[PDB]
Amino acid sequence: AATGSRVTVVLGAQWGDEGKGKVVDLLATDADIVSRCQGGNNAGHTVVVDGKEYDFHLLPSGIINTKAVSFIGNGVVIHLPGLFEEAEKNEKKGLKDWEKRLIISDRAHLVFDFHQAVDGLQEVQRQAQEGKNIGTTKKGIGPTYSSKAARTGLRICDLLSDFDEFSARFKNLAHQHQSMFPTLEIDVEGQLKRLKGFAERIRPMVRDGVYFMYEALHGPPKKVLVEGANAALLDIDFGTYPFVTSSNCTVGGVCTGLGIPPQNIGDVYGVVKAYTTRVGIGAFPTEQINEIGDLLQNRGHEWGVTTGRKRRCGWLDLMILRYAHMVNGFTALALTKLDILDVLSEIKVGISYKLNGKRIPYFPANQEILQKVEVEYETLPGWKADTTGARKWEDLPPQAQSYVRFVENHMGVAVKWVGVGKSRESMIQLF
Amino acid sequence: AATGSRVTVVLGAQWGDEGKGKVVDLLATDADIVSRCQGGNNAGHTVVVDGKEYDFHLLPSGIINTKAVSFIGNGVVIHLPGLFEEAEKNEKKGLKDWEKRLIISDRAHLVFDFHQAVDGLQEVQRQAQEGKNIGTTKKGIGPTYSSKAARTGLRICDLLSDFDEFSARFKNLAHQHQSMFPTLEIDVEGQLKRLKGFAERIRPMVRDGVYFMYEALHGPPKKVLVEGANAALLDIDFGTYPFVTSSNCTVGGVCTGLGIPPQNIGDVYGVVKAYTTRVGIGAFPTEQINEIGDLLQNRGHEWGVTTGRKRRCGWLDLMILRYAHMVNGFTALALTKLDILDVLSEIKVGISYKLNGKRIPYFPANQEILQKVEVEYETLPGWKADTTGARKWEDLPPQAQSYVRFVENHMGVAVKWVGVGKSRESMIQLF
Ligand SMILES: Nc1nc2c(ncn2[C@@H]2O[C@H](COP(=O)(O)OP(=O)(O)O)[C@@H](O)[C@H]2O)c(=O)[nH]1
Ligand SMILES: Nc1nc2c(ncn2[C@@H]2O[C@H](COP(=O)(O)OP(=O)(O)O)[C@@H](O)[C@H]2O)c(=O)[nH]1
Ligand SMILES: O=P(O)(O)OC[C@H]1O[C@@H](n2cnc3c(OP(=O)(O)O)ncnc32)[C@H](O)[C@@H]1O
Ligand SMILES: O=P(O)(O)OC[C@H]1O[C@@H](n2cnc3c(OP(=O)(O)O)ncnc32)[C@H](O)[C@@H]1O
Ligand SMILES: O=CN(O)CC(=O)O
Ligand SMILES: O=CN(O)CC(=O)O
Ligand SMILES: [Mg+2]
Ligand SMILES: [Mg+2]
């Protein structure tokens, strides 16, 4: 107890959009603190409660919980205009006094308008050069994380300190990018002015996140929830590089993005969609570009919560999941969108990859090798029944139960939740 | 046990060069695997054994241990020429068959010659512009971590796959930098050719680090040691930004740099020098630019193991140490270079900072605020006796013991080791 309490973590086990927003929302009901540790607003997390639906991006999904404090960690890159723009969209949905329960770490880096603009330019440039780009959300996430590493980026604490100093580096940073993209137009005083405004708006919410989390973990017992963004296979280190996002979406990102030791990390839940989706460029072994893909894409309403882009769809892929578990060490899983499969007579599930007629011993570090593998499946029998109404383990029909077990067994991790709808109550807790 | 074994970690608690090489060497004697998780060869870790001295940079310090396997994780950025150049320097010291016990993660990013060249240029540019630069080791660490985030950098697996594809992106990446520094000269085919050579040299050592560490942690019990590089206050997120290195030197870096969950991290030792040193630009509250600084710098032989640069010296600083503990959650400490203090009649120790005559509640996120604080000290009585010979807790004289306790008490972390020399046997294990 001297060490402190342990946070609960919700992580994406695939290529994002697995249902982290829904899982976090569920768990956030009785949490004292809900936080984001990495990424920016490239994330799109959907929460449904009482017929009311919200789409969060920078705001932690537990922001709707009026008793809880939503915290944005130092690992997150913030675009201030987008933040308020987002918060103000949810005001119109009933989000009241959110600015009263939102803490922002003063070490978080800032996404500047030219970062997003550079994001665009770099994509058009890679496309109109090598034929294809990464397919980023063009939210300037990659550019801003690149300025962070370079140590040229600015942080919250910078914006709130002397503004004349800030403006000095801001002008200099901008110029640096214009050197990358001469055709890049930046309204220095224009943007810089708005920034000056934002400073006073955010100021009251800002704090030292390190002391904040530390004090929280060692003071009277509290329940802290960490909302992962993106997912394992999108991890800058472990994902399908270079077709990944620019932050560590894996468990280690919790430590680096909030400044807490591995001794303060409790349960780490892996959010697993019953089938796989990917939005953007890059290998997708079980991708189904056919009638099956369309049923999944359509029945699942698979379109970017952030870009409106239609997501690619495929069968469940155990190779990526097992790989994800090796890096995150999930304590239990949340198997989502099981109901999407209610209508299939049979459901194929990828179990291994084969390159030269030979099976691969492990998930390829080289993404191109992945674009050449021939996955071998395990056809399972559908249940052809509506499960959207199930609320208990028994409500599920026989073949639905077998599907959950198939997942538990081939991964070696227990399924603690089963999603059968997008609304908070459309959940089944198995233990 | 189902989860697996837990690794032991050695981290720097200050601004580097605290003695991690000496601590790792000590602990590596009976380790099965010793690894690096972040940084590159900007690191300089000194090991002394049997009168024989080694200076490691990319090679894990446990490389001298012939029974153990030295592993370079995916969080590390490698400059191949420097790696062999380093390994070949230690051959001339008796390092035999090292290439037989060195594993290299195939996801590690590559530092290219132009990265180091860009490092130089950027420094000269910041200096000859705003008056001062960061004071990097000019090993191209910042530039290569910036290419990683941008997803433009290349990795081991890339170098070893099709070389024609590699060369394609290599040429493109180079051009990108020349756009940053037009005066930057790159011998594409020249460098690219050498790279082609290195590929075959490193190839046999490369492996999938994720599967490697995973298998190691779950197979028959083994002892894995993780050698941190740089230190807490140099952390890209938590250090004295922008006067920091470009990787997470804190505990979370172990998870992201090796792909292991917080559940596989055991003891995390903080290496603490009895006084503080910093090499490069940036705030240094207890810095002693005087006769005291010279005695410390001189008696301690404080000059860069990597750049030959004379390190800045100051009294011990508890503010940074306590802050370091908040982020790393040290389980025990290694108080090094206690013997350097053998001659002082009294020893001042910084306990808090004061900005406006008022004490600060916590370590400033803004580094400039740090350049304005007035530290308040706690003068302790020296022992004025030679401790270089002590090997037990009792050998130490009264005032030496009080110094160790002062540290244990003001940090809330136990000192498990006390350094009284640079040789492996010049250690005292308190428990
Ligand atoms: N039918 C159904 N929809 C679900 C379920 N869980 C989540 N969803 C929806 O699936 C979508 C997942 O996209 P997204 O919100 O981006 O996931 P996130 O980015 O991981 O938070 C959302 O529109 C959710 O409402 C489930 O169990 N069943
Ligand atoms: N006298 C003395 N020297 C020590 C002790 N521990 C380490 N050193 C020396 O202090 C220096 C620390 O620099 P460095 O090797 O860069 O530390 P690292 O980068 O943290 O591994 C080395 O030259 C060590 O040999 C100690 O207890 N006493
Ligand atoms: O540089 P970026 O803008 O991050 O784009 C890099 C790649 O990563 C993808 N991507 C980024 N965030 C994603 C997300 O987040 P959530 O699960 O939190 O809703 N869900 C799905 N895909 C996501 C993009 O489509 C792109 O291929
Ligand atoms: O971009 P970089 O080349 O990393 O420089 C950024 C800043 O970080 C410092 N620095 C980097 N590695 C260091 C080291 O490592 P070890 O403790 O492992 O031996 N020990 C001390 N100082 C170190 C540099 O002096 C500089 O101010
Ligand atoms: O929910 C977020 N994503 O799916 C990203 C996007 O819309 O591209
Ligand atoms: O041991 C490494 N450092 O001290 C870095 C340097 O020499 O600058
Ligand atoms: Mg989403
Ligand atoms: Mg060193």
DSSP B58-113: SS-GGGG-SSSEEEE-TTBEE-HHHHHHHHHHHHTTT--SGGGSEEEETTPEEPPH
What residue type is A245 in one-letter code? T
Residues of chain B within CATH 3.40.440.10 domain(s) are 5-105+206-271
* Helices A80-91 + A188-202 axis angle, to 10: 50
Question: After which residues, if any, is chain B broken (C to N > 2.5 Å)?
Answer: none
**Number of residues assigned to chain B:** 431
Of the candidates A238, A257, A366, the beta carbon closest to that of B210 is on: A238
CA of A333 to the centre of ligand 3 (A): 21
Instruction: Quote the minimal CA–CA distance from A372 to chain B in Å.
Output: 13
The answer to whether A208 and B365 are in contact (CB under 8 A) is yes
User: Cα(A365)–Cα(A377) distance, rounded to whole angstroms?
Assistant: 22
CA of A218 to the centre of ligand 5 (A): 36
Q: Does A295 touch chain B (CB under 8 A)?
A: no
Report CB contact under 8 Å: B210, A326.
yes
Report CB contact under 8 Å: A155, B241.
yes
Experimental method: X-ray
Which residue of chain B comes nearest to A147, CA vs CA?
B146
* Pocket-testing residue among A47, A337, A429, ligand 1, by greatest number of atoms within 8 A of Cβ: A337
Residues of B numbered 116-155 whose beta carbons fall under 8 angstroms of chain A's beta carbons: which are they? 130, 134, 142-143, 145-146, 148-152, 155
User: Cα(B200)–Cα(B204) distance, rounded to whole angstroms?
Assistant: 7
Q: How far apart are the first and last CA of chain B?
A: 26
How far are the Cα atoms of A111, B20, B115 from residue B46, in angstroms, in the given order?
Answer: 40, 8, 26
Instruction: Show the CA angle centred on residue A115, arms to residues A109 and A116, nearest 5°.
Output: 115
User: Cα(B407)–Cα(B272) distance, rounded to whole angstroms?
Assistant: 10
Which residue of chain A comes nearest to B157, CA vs CA?
A366
**Alpha carbon B262 to chain centroid distance?**
20
Sheet containing A33-36: order of strands: A206-207, A102-105, A69-72, A33-36, A224-227, A7-12, A265-273, A332-336, A415-419, A427-429
The yes-or-no answer on residue B119 being catalytic is no
Both tokens assigned to B146: 């910036």
Interface test with B, best of A172, A256, A363 (most B CBs within 10 A): A256
A272-431 domain in CATH 3.40.1160.10?
no
* Helices B188-202 + B80-91 axis angle, to 10: 50
Residue A119 Ramachandran class (φ > 0 left, ψ -120 to 50 alpha, else beta): alpha
Report CB contact under 8 Å: A327, B3.
no
Residue ranges lining ligand 3, Cβ < 6 Å: A 12, 15-17, 42-45, 134-137, 139, 141-142, 229-231, 234, 243, 245-246, 279-280, 305
Residues of chain A within CATH 1.10.300.10 domain(s) are 106-205
* Helices B318-328 + B398-411 axis angle, to 10: 50
CA of A304 to the centre of ligand 7 (A): 7
Q: Which fold has domain B5-105+206-271?
A: Adenylosuccinate Synthetase; Chain A, domain 1 (3.40.440)
User: Cα(A295)–Cα(A81) distance, rounded to whole angstroms?
Assistant: 37
* DSSP per position, B346-359: EE-EEEE-BSSSSB
The answer to whether A303 and A17 are in contact (CB under 8 A) is no
The answer to whether B68 and B62 are in contact (CB under 8 A) is yes
Residues of chain A within CATH 3.90.170.10 domain(s) are 272-431
Report CB contact under 8 Å: A157, B251.
no
Specify the CATH number for A106-205; select among 3.40.50.1000, 1.10.260.30, 1.10.300.10, 3.40.50.1220: 1.10.300.10
Q: Residues of B with CB below 8 A from A261's CB?
A: 251-252, 262, 268, 327-329
